[PDB]
Each structure stands twice: as structure tokens, then as C-alpha cells.
Design a protein around this ligand. Structure first.
Ligand SMILES: [Zn+2]
Ligand SMILES: [Zn+2]
Ligand SMILES: [Zn+2]
Length: 84
DNA sequence: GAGGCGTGGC
DNA sequence: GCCACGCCTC
């Protein structure tokens, strides 16, 4: 698995990874936003999932030692380290 | 917090 | 391919 574009030599493990990377060279964005009047599109599926947080303000990851909640797991993981 | 992105089990 | 974990950088 290797990117065969103009000069890019980046190599990935799976083909799923390589296929996604090539979207940076083509600008293809297969993942559209179904929100009414948004029209946004993204290269990665997880990128679109985050954009839905904007419209919904959803925050599923909640700190069990606080009332705070977060949109992403890595946000909560860093907050938890603050409680030690 | 947000964006970009590398990665692995399924 | 999906999707989730999680590191990097600002
Ligand atoms: Zn490339
Ligand atoms: Zn949208
Ligand atoms: Zn907390």
C-alpha cells in the first residue's frame, strides 16, 4: 500500500486507509450533511459525525466525577486526568 | 474545543 | 468500509 500520486510517498497499512488519503489529492468528499440547509461535505465519515455535534450540540461523553460532558472521548480523557 | 489525521477490530 | 480510539497541533 503506497500513495502513487505526483510526489506523495505516504504508505498506509490497510487499503481503506490509502483510499481515504487520496481524497486529499482529489478533494472528493463522499460524506454529505443531511441537515436541512447545510450542504456541507467531508472527506471522512468521522469528520461528518463531528459536524453533526454542531447542529445537535450533542455531548455523550460525560465525566462520572463531574456534571460536565464532552463531544469526543479524547476531550473527556484529558479532563479526567485533571481529577487524578 | 476544534480540526486533521494515523490506526485497528469488526 | 464503518467507526471508534486517540495522538498531534493550533
Ligand atoms: Zn498522497
Ligand atoms: Zn451540517
Ligand atoms: Zn469531571
Amino acid at each position: 500500500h503506497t500513495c502513487d500520486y505526483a510526489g506523495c510517498g505516504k504508505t498506509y497499512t490497510k487499503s481503506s486507509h490509502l483510499k481515504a488519503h487520496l481524497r486529499t489529492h482529489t478533494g472528493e468528499k463522499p460524506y454529505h450533511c443531511d441537515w436541512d440547509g447545510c450542504g456541507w461535505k467531508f472527506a471522512r465519515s468521522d469528520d461528518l459525525t463531528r459536524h453533526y455535534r454542531k447542529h445537535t450540540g450533542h455531548r455523550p461523553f460525560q465525566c462520572q466525577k463531574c456534571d460536565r460532558a464532552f463531544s469526543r472521548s479524547d476531550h473527556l480523557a484529558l479532563h479526567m486526568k485533571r481529577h487524578f
